Tab-separated table of C-alpha atoms in Angstrom:
chain	number	residue	atom	x	y	z
A	1	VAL	CA	212.344	66.772	93.778
A	2	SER	CA	210.712	65.457	90.622
A	3	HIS	CA	211.279	65.556	86.868
A	4	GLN	CA	210.196	63.588	83.815
A	5	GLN	CA	212.592	61.463	81.775
A	6	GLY	CA	214.955	63.400	79.513
A	7	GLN	CA	214.921	66.469	81.730
A	8	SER	CA	217.919	67.682	83.759
A	9	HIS	CA	218.613	67.992	87.465
A	10	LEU	CA	221.439	69.796	89.228
A	11	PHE	CA	222.297	68.793	92.815
A	12	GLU	CA	224.041	71.487	94.844
A	13	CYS	CA	227.026	70.716	97.032
A	14	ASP	CA	226.261	73.233	99.772
A	15	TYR	CA	229.091	72.355	102.155
A	16	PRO	CA	231.148	75.507	102.893
A	17	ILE	CA	234.541	74.796	101.290
A	18	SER	CA	237.320	77.094	102.493
A	19	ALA	CA	240.500	75.198	101.595
A	20	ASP	CA	242.632	75.718	98.486
A	21	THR	CA	242.900	71.964	98.012
A	22	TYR	CA	239.961	69.616	98.493
A	23	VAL	CA	238.213	66.469	97.349
A	24	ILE	CA	234.534	66.192	96.482
A	25	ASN	CA	232.512	63.004	96.180
A	26	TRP	CA	228.907	62.627	95.112
A	27	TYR	CA	226.969	59.697	96.519
A	28	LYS	CA	223.901	57.886	95.232
A	29	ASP	CA	222.171	55.740	97.865
A	30	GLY	CA	225.481	55.613	99.741
A	31	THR	CA	227.712	54.637	96.814
A	32	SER	CA	230.145	57.088	95.214
A	33	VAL	CA	229.197	58.043	91.643
A	34	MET	CA	231.807	60.797	91.178
A	35	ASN	CA	235.135	61.789	92.704
A	36	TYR	CA	237.056	65.026	92.180
A	37	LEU	CA	240.379	66.404	93.389
A	38	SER	CA	240.633	70.199	93.214
A	39	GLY	CA	242.596	71.147	90.099
A	40	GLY	CA	242.090	67.733	88.526
A	41	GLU	CA	239.286	66.203	86.468
A	42	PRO	CA	235.998	64.749	87.735
A	43	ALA	CA	235.732	60.971	87.363
A	44	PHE	CA	232.258	59.438	87.213
A	45	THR	CA	231.775	55.938	88.591
A	46	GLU	CA	229.245	53.174	89.212
A	47	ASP	CA	225.800	54.161	87.875
A	48	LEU	CA	227.251	57.341	86.379
A	49	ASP	CA	230.059	55.494	84.608
A	50	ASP	CA	229.768	55.624	80.808
A	51	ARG	CA	227.129	58.373	80.854
A	52	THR	CA	227.764	61.263	78.465
A	53	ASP	CA	224.903	63.291	79.952
A	54	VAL	CA	226.636	64.027	83.270
A	55	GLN	CA	228.351	67.275	84.228
A	56	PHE	CA	230.374	68.620	87.134
A	57	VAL	CA	229.583	72.315	87.307
A	58	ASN	CA	231.304	75.112	89.236
A	59	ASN	CA	233.746	72.594	90.760
A	60	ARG	CA	230.919	71.696	93.165
A	61	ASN	CA	227.628	70.498	91.736
A	62	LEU	CA	226.451	67.295	90.056
A	63	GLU	CA	224.240	67.517	86.962
A	64	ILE	CA	222.409	64.793	85.040
A	65	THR	CA	221.012	66.202	81.790
A	66	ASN	CA	219.119	63.155	80.484
A	67	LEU	CA	217.302	61.737	83.503
A	68	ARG	CA	216.301	58.082	83.572
A	69	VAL	CA	213.996	56.339	86.010
A	70	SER	CA	217.071	54.394	87.157
A	71	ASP	CA	218.618	57.691	88.300
A	72	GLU	CA	216.121	57.886	91.169
A	73	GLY	CA	217.696	57.766	94.619
A	74	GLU	CA	219.227	59.847	97.398
A	75	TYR	CA	222.081	62.171	96.478
A	76	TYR	CA	224.523	64.142	98.597
A	77	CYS	CA	228.098	65.396	98.376
A	78	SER	CA	230.931	64.794	100.843
A	79	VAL	CA	233.790	67.290	101.102
A	80	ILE	CA	237.307	66.673	102.392
A	81	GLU	CA	239.581	69.681	102.884
A	82	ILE	CA	243.300	68.975	102.474
A	83	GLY	CA	245.962	70.592	104.650
A	84	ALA	CA	246.211	72.353	107.998
A	85	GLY	CA	242.925	72.989	109.782
A	86	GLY	CA	241.178	71.079	107.007
A	87	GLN	CA	237.653	69.885	107.755
A	88	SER	CA	235.217	67.398	106.254
A	89	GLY	CA	231.438	67.135	106.045
A	90	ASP	CA	228.391	66.402	103.904
A	91	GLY	CA	226.140	68.621	101.829
A	92	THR	CA	222.351	68.468	101.992
A	93	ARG	CA	220.720	65.152	101.079
A	94	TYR	CA	218.317	65.234	98.117
A	95	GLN	CA	215.748	62.674	97.013
A	96	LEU	CA	215.364	62.579	93.228
A	97	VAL	CA	212.126	61.351	91.695
A	98	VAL	CA	211.942	60.651	87.960
A	99	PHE	CA	208.299	60.052	87.082
A	100	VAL	CA	206.481	58.746	84.017
A	101	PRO	CA	202.759	59.567	83.703
A	102	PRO	CA	200.468	56.562	83.114
A	103	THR	CA	199.669	55.383	79.599
A	104	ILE	CA	197.111	52.575	79.575
A	105	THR	CA	197.047	49.373	77.540
A	106	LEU	CA	194.169	46.858	77.738
A	107	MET	CA	194.406	43.043	77.674
A	108	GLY	CA	191.447	40.662	77.649
A	109	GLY	CA	188.015	39.853	76.252
A	110	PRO	CA	185.782	38.834	74.749
A	111	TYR	CA	184.049	42.211	74.441
A	112	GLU	CA	181.187	40.572	72.575
A	113	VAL	CA	179.793	38.052	75.040
A	114	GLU	CA	177.246	35.265	74.717
A	115	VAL	CA	174.453	35.269	77.278
A	116	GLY	CA	175.557	33.271	80.314
A	117	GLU	CA	179.229	33.328	79.333
A	118	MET	CA	182.120	35.272	80.863
A	119	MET	CA	184.789	37.858	80.063
A	120	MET	CA	187.866	39.292	81.777
A	121	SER	CA	189.875	42.444	81.091
A	122	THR	CA	193.164	43.459	82.682
A	123	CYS	CA	194.003	47.147	82.717
A	124	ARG	CA	197.721	47.907	82.570
A	125	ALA	CA	199.796	51.084	82.363
A	126	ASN	CA	203.341	52.126	81.576
A	127	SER	CA	204.246	54.463	84.420
A	128	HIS	CA	206.556	55.285	87.299
A	129	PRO	CA	205.765	54.941	90.071
A	130	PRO	CA	203.470	51.978	89.231
A	131	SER	CA	199.809	53.040	88.977
A	132	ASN	CA	196.711	52.287	91.009
A	133	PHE	CA	193.753	51.055	88.949
A	134	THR	CA	189.974	51.167	89.007
A	135	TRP	CA	187.221	50.081	86.639
A	136	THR	CA	184.073	52.151	86.325
A	137	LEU	CA	181.018	50.108	85.301
A	138	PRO	CA	178.175	51.402	83.088
A	139	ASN	CA	176.220	52.175	86.279
A	140	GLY	CA	178.964	54.490	87.563
A	141	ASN	CA	180.073	52.045	90.256
A	142	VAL	CA	183.845	52.162	90.807
A	143	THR	CA	185.664	48.858	91.310
A	144	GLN	CA	189.158	48.838	92.784
A	145	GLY	CA	191.828	46.833	90.984
A	146	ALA	CA	193.210	46.302	87.489
A	147	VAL	CA	191.035	43.296	86.667
A	148	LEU	CA	187.502	43.545	85.266
A	149	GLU	CA	185.418	40.377	85.507
A	150	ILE	CA	181.955	39.491	84.199
A	151	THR	CA	180.709	35.991	85.056
A	152	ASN	CA	177.128	35.736	83.852
A	153	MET	CA	176.547	38.137	81.032
A	154	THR	CA	173.046	39.725	81.033
A	155	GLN	CA	171.370	42.592	79.190
A	156	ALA	CA	172.178	44.431	82.424
A	157	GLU	CA	175.936	44.153	81.886
A	158	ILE	CA	176.111	45.657	78.400
A	159	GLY	CA	177.533	49.174	78.244
A	160	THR	CA	180.687	51.258	78.482
A	161	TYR	CA	183.368	50.244	80.996
A	162	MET	CA	186.224	52.574	81.949
A	163	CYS	CA	189.635	51.844	83.446
A	164	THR	CA	191.479	54.634	85.237
A	165	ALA	CA	195.179	54.515	86.091
A	166	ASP	CA	196.714	57.032	88.502
A	167	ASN	CA	200.185	57.045	90.080
A	168	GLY	CA	200.133	60.437	91.796
A	169	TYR	CA	201.971	61.946	88.825
A	170	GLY	CA	199.203	61.905	86.242
A	171	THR	CA	196.120	59.988	85.197
A	172	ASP	CA	194.986	58.089	82.103
A	173	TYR	CA	191.715	56.366	81.278
A	174	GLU	CA	190.367	54.036	78.619
A	175	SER	CA	186.784	53.057	77.841
A	176	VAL	CA	185.609	49.923	76.065
A	177	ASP	CA	182.151	48.615	75.196
A	178	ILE	CA	180.971	45.232	76.381
A	179	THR	CA	178.020	44.010	74.313
A	180	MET	CA	176.167	40.751	73.692
B	1	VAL	CA	191.449	69.671	77.336
B	2	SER	CA	195.012	68.410	77.583
B	3	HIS	CA	196.859	65.094	77.702
B	4	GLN	CA	200.376	63.817	77.091
B	5	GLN	CA	201.271	61.555	74.175
B	6	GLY	CA	200.171	57.934	74.534
B	7	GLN	CA	197.246	58.809	76.773
B	8	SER	CA	193.584	58.481	75.744
B	9	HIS	CA	190.789	60.973	75.202
B	10	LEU	CA	187.077	60.350	74.772
B	11	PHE	CA	184.948	63.047	73.099
B	12	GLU	CA	181.260	62.944	73.997
B	13	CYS	CA	178.560	63.336	71.381
B	14	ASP	CA	176.055	65.177	73.564
B	15	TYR	CA	173.389	65.837	70.935
B	16	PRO	CA	170.041	64.406	72.141
B	17	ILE	CA	169.326	61.547	69.712
B	18	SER	CA	165.716	60.357	69.760
B	19	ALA	CA	165.335	58.522	66.444
B	20	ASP	CA	165.629	54.767	65.898
B	21	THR	CA	167.734	55.357	62.798
B	22	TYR	CA	170.462	57.987	62.636
B	23	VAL	CA	173.863	58.930	61.290
B	24	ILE	CA	176.748	60.266	63.354
B	25	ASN	CA	179.834	62.036	62.054
B	26	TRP	CA	182.846	63.203	64.014
B	27	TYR	CA	184.724	66.213	62.697
B	28	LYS	CA	188.302	67.345	63.217
B	29	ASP	CA	188.908	70.989	62.276
B	30	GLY	CA	185.858	70.770	60.009
B	31	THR	CA	186.774	67.549	58.197
B	32	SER	CA	184.965	64.266	58.856
B	33	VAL	CA	187.165	61.643	60.543
B	34	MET	CA	184.412	59.080	61.224
B	35	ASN	CA	180.968	58.242	59.872
B	36	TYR	CA	178.410	55.854	61.355
B	37	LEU	CA	174.954	54.652	60.346
B	38	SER	CA	172.899	53.258	63.232
B	39	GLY	CA	173.073	49.461	63.130
B	40	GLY	CA	176.122	49.485	60.874
B	41	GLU	CA	179.852	49.782	61.538
B	42	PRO	CA	181.849	52.957	62.215
B	43	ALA	CA	184.228	53.918	59.405
B	44	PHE	CA	187.224	56.087	60.273
B	45	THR	CA	188.543	58.473	57.637
B	46	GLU	CA	191.161	61.121	56.885
B	47	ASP	CA	193.516	61.585	59.862
B	48	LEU	CA	191.853	58.689	61.678
B	49	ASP	CA	192.191	56.341	58.711
B	50	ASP	CA	194.567	53.433	59.372
B	51	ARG	CA	194.679	54.051	63.130
B	52	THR	CA	194.195	50.961	65.293
B	53	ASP	CA	193.962	53.057	68.464
B	54	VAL	CA	190.547	54.564	67.681
B	55	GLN	CA	187.222	53.461	69.144
B	56	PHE	CA	183.556	54.308	68.714
B	57	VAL	CA	181.977	53.772	72.109
B	58	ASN	CA	178.308	53.571	73.114
B	59	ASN	CA	177.255	54.237	69.498
B	60	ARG	CA	178.000	57.911	70.227
B	61	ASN	CA	181.473	58.867	71.383
B	62	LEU	CA	184.880	59.098	69.706
B	63	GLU	CA	187.944	57.739	71.515
B	64	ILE	CA	191.636	57.981	70.635
B	65	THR	CA	193.675	55.717	72.918
B	66	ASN	CA	197.208	56.578	71.756
B	67	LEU	CA	197.251	60.360	71.406
B	68	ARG	CA	199.747	62.023	69.088
B	69	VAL	CA	200.603	65.697	68.830
B	70	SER	CA	199.091	65.559	65.331
B	71	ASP	CA	195.731	64.677	66.916
B	72	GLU	CA	195.423	68.223	68.272
B	73	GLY	CA	192.476	70.172	66.888
B	74	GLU	CA	188.793	70.959	67.350
B	75	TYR	CA	186.392	68.033	67.588
B	76	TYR	CA	182.611	67.846	67.485
B	77	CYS	CA	179.923	65.410	66.371
B	78	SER	CA	177.058	66.054	63.951
B	79	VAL	CA	173.859	64.012	64.205
B	80	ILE	CA	171.291	63.362	61.484
B	81	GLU	CA	168.035	61.663	62.471
B	82	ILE	CA	166.409	59.580	59.730
B	83	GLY	CA	162.648	59.427	59.209
B	84	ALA	CA	159.569	61.439	60.122
B	85	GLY	CA	160.151	64.409	62.411
B	86	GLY	CA	163.871	63.687	62.213
B	87	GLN	CA	166.184	66.499	63.292
B	88	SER	CA	169.865	67.327	62.918
B	89	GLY	CA	172.409	69.235	64.987
B	90	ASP	CA	175.914	69.358	66.438
B	91	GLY	CA	177.339	68.241	69.758
B	92	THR	CA	179.609	70.418	71.882
B	93	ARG	CA	182.890	71.533	70.308
B	94	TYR	CA	186.066	70.422	72.107
B	95	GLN	CA	189.629	71.657	71.715
B	96	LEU	CA	192.170	68.875	72.252
B	97	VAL	CA	195.689	69.730	73.362
B	98	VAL	CA	198.400	67.061	73.292
B	99	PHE	CA	201.439	68.465	75.078
B	100	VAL	CA	205.056	67.372	75.434
B	101	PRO	CA	207.056	68.847	78.341
B	102	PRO	CA	210.379	70.477	77.376
B	103	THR	CA	213.583	68.449	77.271
B	104	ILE	CA	216.625	70.612	76.566
B	105	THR	CA	219.571	69.971	74.260
B	106	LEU	CA	222.519	72.394	73.957
B	107	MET	CA	224.431	73.344	70.786
B	108	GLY	CA	227.489	75.591	70.660
B	109	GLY	CA	230.823	76.532	72.206
B	110	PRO	CA	233.606	76.818	72.880
B	111	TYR	CA	233.052	76.491	76.633
B	112	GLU	CA	236.759	77.003	77.226
B	113	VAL	CA	237.461	80.446	75.803
B	114	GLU	CA	240.664	82.358	75.138
B	115	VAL	CA	240.819	85.871	76.550
B	116	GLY	CA	239.396	88.294	73.995
B	117	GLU	CA	237.735	85.556	71.947
B	118	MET	CA	234.050	84.672	71.613
B	119	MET	CA	231.550	81.861	72.159
B	120	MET	CA	227.911	81.175	71.290
B	121	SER	CA	225.442	78.635	72.669
B	122	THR	CA	221.971	77.863	71.352
B	123	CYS	CA	219.494	76.358	73.783
B	124	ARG	CA	216.937	74.052	72.184
B	125	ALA	CA	214.129	71.852	73.494
B	126	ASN	CA	211.908	69.044	72.286
B	127	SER	CA	208.429	70.139	73.318
B	128	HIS	CA	204.881	70.967	72.303
B	129	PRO	CA	203.886	73.692	72.222
B	130	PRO	CA	207.338	75.113	71.318
B	131	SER	CA	209.138	76.531	74.375
B	132	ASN	CA	210.193	80.008	75.420
B	133	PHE	CA	213.859	80.296	76.413
B	134	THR	CA	216.046	82.307	78.752
B	135	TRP	CA	219.695	82.198	79.771
B	136	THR	CA	220.689	83.001	83.330
B	137	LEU	CA	224.224	84.404	83.630
B	138	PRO	CA	226.577	83.763	86.581
B	139	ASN	CA	225.444	87.107	88.041
B	140	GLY	CA	221.798	85.995	88.116
B	141	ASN	CA	220.812	88.274	85.236
B	142	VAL	CA	218.146	86.685	83.021
B	143	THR	CA	218.493	87.100	79.255
B	144	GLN	CA	215.515	86.431	77.004
B	145	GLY	CA	216.038	84.180	73.996
B	146	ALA	CA	217.571	80.825	73.101
B	147	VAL	CA	220.963	82.209	72.092
B	148	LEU	CA	223.800	82.887	74.540
B	149	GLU	CA	226.588	85.117	73.239
B	150	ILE	CA	229.928	86.167	74.733
B	151	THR	CA	232.018	88.542	72.605
B	152	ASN	CA	235.033	89.552	74.661
B	153	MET	CA	235.798	86.905	77.203
B	154	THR	CA	237.071	88.288	80.557
B	155	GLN	CA	237.668	86.859	84.026
B	156	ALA	CA	234.278	88.463	84.680
B	157	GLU	CA	232.477	86.131	82.269
B	158	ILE	CA	233.658	82.820	83.715
B	159	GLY	CA	231.034	80.905	85.681
B	160	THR	CA	227.887	78.811	85.432
B	161	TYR	CA	225.304	79.695	82.771
B	162	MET	CA	221.779	78.256	82.824
B	163	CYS	CA	219.213	77.860	80.055
B	164	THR	CA	215.556	77.487	80.994
B	165	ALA	CA	212.875	76.246	78.605
B	166	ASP	CA	209.180	76.610	79.448
B	167	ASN	CA	206.136	76.028	77.226
B	168	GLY	CA	203.350	76.419	79.783
B	169	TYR	CA	203.217	72.637	80.188
B	170	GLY	CA	206.451	72.056	82.068
B	171	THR	CA	209.949	73.420	82.489
B	172	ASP	CA	213.485	72.118	81.967
B	173	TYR	CA	216.862	73.699	82.632
B	174	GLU	CA	220.494	72.984	81.851
B	175	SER	CA	223.639	74.547	83.289
B	176	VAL	CA	227.065	74.681	81.676
B	177	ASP	CA	230.362	76.203	82.787
B	178	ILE	CA	232.154	78.770	80.679
B	179	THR	CA	235.816	79.045	81.677
B	180	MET	CA	239.028	80.492	80.252
């Protein structure tokens, strides 16, 4: 399940609780990030320690109201019923994705090139997951990879070059002219 | 055509230029934001003045590489051919949308309410365009509007309440418990 940064997500503890007294834990990648004893107060731990944007709702469910990329991971609750006939088990496991669409920045040059000289340009992008890159040359040809390289500048190489960055959660492009 | 903030957009001047000497202007909502004389240098004006993230590519096209919400508007180029038989005309008009998905923040209370007393909660969201809001009550009933209001707290009103914000370009929600 995916969201962008700053958005909320609520994980449901869907284990059938039937005891008057019980303990709930929420786990992130196998480590407890919240513990709760029925009738008490939820205590948030580890990655969720010192976060003001976390909530325990309906005495069951975990909510993070200001998602960060670092919040990504697998979440599930474990329930322990206290007293006679008391059972224990886990809720459904959820995989949280917090994505950031690509925004490109370009590093390199020169973009004005002497005949017979060279240039290099590295396309980069702020994103999550990390993006895949291509360069599109003035002739439409698509090159795979973040690095654009011209080794022997000719009248044939002058034109508009376009980087594209795509991480499955959005796309960005940026065009620059290479001239003599 | 839509993008998120920080992404690029390139507007094409698709007027058929056939003169050796010509002038190109780019307009935003009817006001010139760039002028260019063939063989000279592009000069960016008005809203595009003092922006380092603007480019004039292929002696034709306008590019903004760090989009802001304020960049929204209608864009088109106008071409003036200089000399004998010289013509003039406009390129295609484009409508640029720069959206921000909703991120909710909640304002109000109390969320612990005395019997017979009242509470109010106002759901808000950072977004563009501005979002439409609903509250979902513990009984599933969906109320339209950003404001949640409880006037006579009863055992019947306790439970989880959920605001949803949606602006056509994404959705966010946030759940809070109202108890006695």
